[PDB]
């Protein structure tokens, strides 16, 4: 589809931080973009609103989307427990890339990461499906609440999310 734009309003311990909006490349990975779009609108009656980024590693990425377990073990797609790696056409080209976290081939669920650096070593292992459109400075501010091991000094949540266009 003509590329959807989704927003996340980030909060830190309840205090608002701001909005990051994403362009989803539904023109190259339609199935993967669509799973992330619908979890952002919560239209299948489940999704990202209220979940947290449970692992933030400065200089690398911010990981979230585990709305089931909040720690890396849960989450699910709108297509069921997991779905296949649609394609590896897009690469991890620099800060702002949005890509799917997984537990090996074809295990995509709901977990994702926002790259705060170019992560070329993940190319061909993780499906890139979007990029930050506005609010990269909100993402760089979220990096500061993480650590080498990804534990966060505060609870970073997606207080509200939806589609813009």
């Amino acid at each position: 589809m003509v590329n959807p734009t989704v927003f996340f309003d980030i909060a830190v311990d309840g205090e608002p931080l701001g909005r990051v909006s994403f362009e989803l490349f539904a023109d190259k990975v339609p199935k993967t973009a669509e799973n992330f779009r619908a979890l952002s609108t919560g239209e299948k009656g489940f999704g990202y609103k209220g979940s947290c980024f449970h692992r933030i590693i400065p200089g690398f990425m911010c990981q979230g989307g585990d709305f089931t377990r909040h720690n890396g073990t849960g989450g699910k797609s709108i297509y069921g427990e997991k779905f296949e790696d649609e394609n590896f056409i897009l690469k991890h080209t620099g800060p702002g890339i949005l890509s799917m976290a997984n537990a090996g081939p074809n295990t995509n669920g709901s977990q994702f990461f926002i790259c705060t650096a170019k992560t070329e070593w993940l190319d061909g292992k993780h499906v890139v499906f979007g990029k930050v459109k506005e609010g990269m400075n909100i993402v760089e501010a979220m990096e500061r609440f993480g650590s080498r091991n990804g534990k966060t000094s505060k609870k970073i949540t997606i207080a509200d999310c939806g589609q813009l266009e």
Binding site: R55, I57, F60, M61, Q63, D66, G72, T73, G75, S99, A101, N102, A103, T107, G109, Q111, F113, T119, W121, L122, H126, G150
Partner: peptide
């Protein structure tokens, strides 16, 4: 190392 997995986090 630097990976993004869901379940067994490696180094």
């Amino acid at each position: 190392x630097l990976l993004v997995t869901a379940x067994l986090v490696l180094a």
